[PDB]
Every structure is written in C-alpha cells, then in structure tokens.
Amino acid sequence: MITLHYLKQSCSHRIVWLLEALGLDYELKIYDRLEGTGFAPEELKAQHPLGKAPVLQDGDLVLAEGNAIIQHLLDRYDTENRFTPAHKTDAYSNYVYWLAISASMFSANLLALVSKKGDLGDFAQYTNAQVGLYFSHVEKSLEGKTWIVGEQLTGADFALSFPLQWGLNYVNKADYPNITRYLEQIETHPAYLKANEKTDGGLDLSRFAENLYFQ
Amino acid sequence: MITLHYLKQSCSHRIVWLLEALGLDYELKIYDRLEGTGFAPEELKAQHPLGKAPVLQDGDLVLAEGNAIIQHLLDRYDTENRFTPAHKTDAYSNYVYWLAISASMFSANLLALVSKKGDLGDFAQYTNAQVGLYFSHVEKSLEGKTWIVGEQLTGADFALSFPLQWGLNYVNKADYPNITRYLEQIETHPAYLKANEKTDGGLDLSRFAENLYFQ
C-alpha cells in the first residue's frame, strides 16, 4: 500500500526513520544522486510534478514534502498518538511550530550557501546570520529538554533532524553542544539505526558536500 | 488574550485574514518596514528570537511561522473544523501538503531572486525554473477546484495566498489564469476585505518591490 521514493543523502532519510518508528510495512525504492551536480535522477523526477524526493505513494495518493508526509503518516498510522502531543496544549502548538521551523531552517541553509557562492557582499553576511539565528534558537530551546517539544518524541524531531544535520556544515558545531547531544540521540535511536540498515547506510554524514543542498 | 505583531507588506496579512475568518477578538500591533532594505524594525525584532513577523502571542505562548500560527489558531479556535478537512482522508492529507508547499514556494521565490541578484550563471536558471515548477503545479492543481483542496476553504488557502501574491512578480502572470482567478477570489473574500480594513489596506499589491522578500 505504501511506497517511498528515497533519494540517498537527502531529507528522505527522516521519513524512513519515521516509518520504522511507526512499525509500518512499505516498499522502498532507492535512488542515487547524479554525479557532480547531486541532482535527482530522471527516474525519480518522474514520480512527482516538482521532481524532488521524498515522494510517498499511499493508495491513490502521491505526496511530496517532508512535513506533509510526516503529518500524513501520523494522521493515518499513529493511532496511539505516540508522536503528536495532546491537542489544544502549548505542547501541540510548539509541535506544529517546530515542524514549520524545520522547513525555514532548510531554506536558511540553502540561501546563505547560495549568497556565498555567487557574490552578494553584505547580503551574504545577512543570510549567514540567519542560519546562526535558527541554530541559536534550537540550541537554546533544547536546554533542559530531551526532544524539541519536551519529554515526548514527536513528528517535529523527525522533521528537524535533517536541517540540523545539514546546517552543521555551515556553522561551527563546537558552538552547539545541545544540538550535538540531540543529534547523537537521533542518530542512535533504534528506529534510526533500522532506517540505516534498510538504506544501505542512511545519511553518510561524513561524506557531506555543498551540492547536497539541492536536487 | 491574543496579540498579533504584524509587519506591513508581508506574510503577516494572511494571518489577519484567518483571524477575521475565525471571528476572533485580538490585539493588532502594526509595524512599518524600514526604508530601503525593507527590514523589520528593531521593535518588532524584539518580539521573538528569530526577529521576524508575524509573531502571535496567545496567553503565555509566543509563536512565529505562518504555518505554525495557522495550525495553532485552527487547533484551538476552529472547533467546527470549518477550515480543516475530515481526518484520515485524502483531503486532509492534501491540506497538510499544500501547507508544506506554501512554505517551499516562498523559499523558491527567495532563492531564484537571490541567484539573479548575485551572479550564479546556470544555477540562476536552475532556481528560476523551480519557481516555474511550483507555479505550474498550483495552476494545474486548481483546475476544476474552487479552493486548493477542493470545495472547502482550508488553512492551506490562507497559507498559499502570500507566496502566490509575491511569486507572481517573478513569473508571467498571464500564463496562470487559474491562479489569477484564485487570487481574485481570496482578495475579495469578505474576511480578507476586513483584514484590509484593520490594517489600513492590507497588502498593497501594486507597490511591490524586491526587498519585500526579506525581513
């Protein structure tokens, strides 16, 4: 019933982490990035009008967008609400907040990188400072907390994992001890280790390159 | 109980549209963009660690991020579920999908613009093509539909309004008749007209400039 189209070295990995955490059966189709550019190959691009991974098929539905896929999977398959806070609470509101932040952070990663590549001058420093602001905010928000919302592992942690992993390449990781602790907690989470097994090694965090911010 | 910190000519406007659609009482604090740069003024930046608008205070909660604020408001105040589809349906999944797309589209708007400003060469055409892909996808998806999910006006329409309004400045609006029709439907929606009244004219779509993509 469920098929995930998965691009190596991408935001697809957090979706496999979630699928494993939910204990779901699914078909996994794995695609390699094109050499040099890092772009999605034409066979993956064909799966969705935007041409990006991840793409989740569920019955007749074809979804893209990490946050959308996360919320879809939780809505249909997390019947115990293991990964969503109780509704009408500050925890629930913070949960949808950190989902939104995850997407904004990725955009910030992307933008500062591009501003550096091309020459933008002062604007390049403006965009670099934005990445710093997001990392500061997550770092401070993790103080005294196991997961981003608090004691409960939620859809937001699945979402946030990737832009933090990617973004650390553009900031000084030594400045963010809470984030470092948090990422180690994610990367050794048993469902995350299972995700690595299913994907022939999930993210190779050691083999990071600038082109990994695009598709 | 609720205070909205609102930046003129920004993604804050869709939040006022939603507040009016929900019939909520709230305090509205309006800030002008700084001249030349278009940046948020220091008084607004002080409201939240990321320094961007909109910022919603609700009791002891201080939220940022359009999608987060939308989902928070619907969770607490849309008890009739006027603006969310029934759960565990394709409509619900498409609703959270179009929320995610809204954020991605804004990022695409931003990125292509910056790639043009600086000189990025072929990469500039790559990013410009992405904006085209998002606009094509919304345009095609509106075919045969009143609102983005279908017959039901949802949180996704509130979200999408802004990146479409902004993005039209970087594409040829004549190529997107469904989007044009859809934006006219939004811009004459009675709650949107009320939003304009409360904000001394909401978005001045006629006074658009490149700096409006930043804060």
The answer to the question of residue A204 being in a domain is no
A101 shares its domain with A166: yes
The answer to whether the beta carbons of residues A199 and A19 sit under 8 Å apart is no
B61-77: b (≥16 Cβ within 10 Å) or e: eebbbbbbbbbbbbbbb
At which of B33, B49, B84 does a domain end?
A: B84
Q: What's the distance, Cα to Cα, between the start and end of chain B in Å?
A: 26
Nearest chain A residue to B114 by CA distance is: A115
Degrees to nearest 5, angle at CA B76 with B71 and B79: 105
At which of A59, A84, A109 does a domain end?
A: A84
Residue B11: give the domain boundaries. Answer: 1-84
The answer to whether the beta carbons of residues A75 and A67 sit under 8 Å apart is no
Resolution of the structure in the document, Å: 1.6
Residues of chain A found within 8 Å of residue B123, distances taken between Cβ atoms: 114, 117-118
Cα dihedral across residues A142, A155, B93, B72: positive or negative: negative
Q: 10 Å Cβ neighbour count for A43?
A: 10
Nearest chain B residue to A105 by CA distance is: B107
- What's the distance, CA A141 to chain centroid? 18
CB contact under 8 Å between A88 and B107, yes or no, is no
A77 shares its domain with A91: no
Pairs of residues, one from chain A and one from chain B, whose beta carbons lie less than 8 Å apart: 136
Degrees to nearest 5, angle at CA B189 with B187 and B191: 110
- What's the CA gap between A163 and B141, in Å, rounded? 28
- What's the distance, CA A194 to chain centroid? 17
In this structure, chain A runs to a length of 215
Residues of chain B found within 8 Å of residue A142, distances taken between Cβ atoms: none
- What's the CA gap between A166 and A175, in Å, rounded? 15
* Token output for A98: 């950190």
State the DSSP code for B210.
G
- What's the distance, CA A158 to chain centroid? 6
Q: Supply the CATH number for residue B109's domain.
A: 1.20.1050.10
The alpha carbon of residue A181 is apart from the nearest alpha carbon of chain B, in Å, by 22
The answer to the question of residue B211 being in a domain is no
Degrees to nearest 5, angle at CA A106 with A15 and A192: 30
A113-151: b (≥16 Cβ within 10 Å) or e: bbbbbbebeebbebbbebbbebbbbbbebbeeeebbbee
Nearest chain A residue to B65 by CA distance is: A100
User: DSSP string of A164-192?
Assistant: HHHHTTTS-GGG-HHHHHHHHHHHTSHHH
* Nearest of B11, B107, B5, B103 to residue B48 by alpha carbon: B5
CB contact under 8 Å between B117 and A136, yes or no, is no
The answer to whether the beta carbons of residues A28 and A16 sit under 8 Å apart is yes
The answer to the question of residue B201 being in a domain is no
B17 shares its domain with B70: yes
Q: 10 Å Cβ neighbour count for A19?
A: 24
CB contact under 8 Å between B72 and A110, yes or no, is no
Cα dihedral across residues B46, B50, B56, B59: positive or negative: negative
* Token output for A158: 């699945």
Burial (0-12, 13-18, 19+ Cβ within 10 Å), A79 = exposed
Nearest chain B residue to A130 by CA distance is: B50
* Nearest of B99, B94, B98, B97 to residue B66 by alpha carbon: B99
A72 shares its domain with A172: no
B63 shares its domain with B164: no
A55 shares its domain with A89: no
Query: Who's near A109: CB < 8 A, 6+ residues apart?
Result: A131, A163, A166, A167, A170, A213
The answer to the question of residue B15 being in a domain is yes
The answer to the question of residue B214 being in a domain is no
Residue at token pair 């932040």? A101
- What's the CA gap between A65 and A53, in Å, rounded? 8
The answer to the question of residue A17 being in a domain is yes
Solved using: X-ray
* Token output for B96: 């959270």
- What's the CA gap between A157 and A152, in Å, rounded? 10
CB contact under 8 Å between B103 and A107, yes or no, is yes
The answer to the question of residue B209 being in a domain is no
Phi, psi of B137, rounded to the nearest 5 degrees:
-65, -45
A90 shares its domain with A172: yes
The answer to the question of residue B32 being in a domain is yes
* Nearest of B148, B204, B157, B164 to residue B32 by alpha carbon: B204
Q: Supply the CATH number for residue B15's domain.
A: 3.40.30.10
Nearest to A133 among B51, B100, B123 (CB): B51
- What's the CA gap between B204 and B191, in Å, rounded? 17
- C-alpha pair distances (Å), A152 with each of A145, A177, A195, B67, B187: 9, 20, 20, 21, 40
Burial (0-12, 13-18, 19+ Cβ within 10 Å), A10 = buried
- What's the CA gap between B43 and B45, in Å, rounded? 6
A106 shares its domain with A19: no
The alpha carbon of residue B76 is apart from the nearest alpha carbon of chain A, in Å, by 5
At which of A36, A59, A84 does a domain end?
A: A84
Residues of chain A found within 8 Å of residue B64, distances taken between Cβ atoms: 97
A187: left (phi over 0), alpha (psi -120 to 50) or beta: alpha
Coil, helix or strand at residue B55? strand
Coil, helix or strand at residue B64? strand
- C-alpha pair distances (Å), B167 with each of A126, B108, B135, B188, B210: 22, 9, 8, 19, 11
* Token output for B159: 């979200």
Coil, helix or strand at residue B105? helix
Mode of pairing for the β-strands spanning B27-31 and B2-7: parallel
A131 shares its domain with A80: no
Instruction: Give chain B's domain count.
Output: 2
Residues of chain B found within 8 Å of residue A123, distances taken between Cβ atoms: 114, 117-118
Residues of chain A found within 8 Å of residue B49, distances taken between Cβ atoms: 133, 136-137, 140
- What's the CA gap between A137 and B58, in Å, rounded? 20
- What's the CA gap between B96 and B74, in Å, rounded? 13
User: DSSP string of B143-178?
Assistant: TT-SSSSSSS--HHHHHHHHHHHHHTTTS-GGG-HH
A132: left (phi over 0), alpha (psi -120 to 50) or beta: alpha
Helix segments in chain A, DSSP class H: 13-22, 42-45, 66-77, 90-117, 122-141, 155-167, 177-187, 190-198
Q: What's the distance, Cα to Cα, between the start and end of chain A in Å?
A: 26
The answer to whether the beta carbons of residues B159 and B18 sit under 8 Å apart is no
A19 shares its domain with A62: yes
The alpha carbon of residue B20 is apart from the nearest alpha carbon of chain A, in Å, by 20
B96 shares its domain with B3: no
B90 shares its domain with B50: no
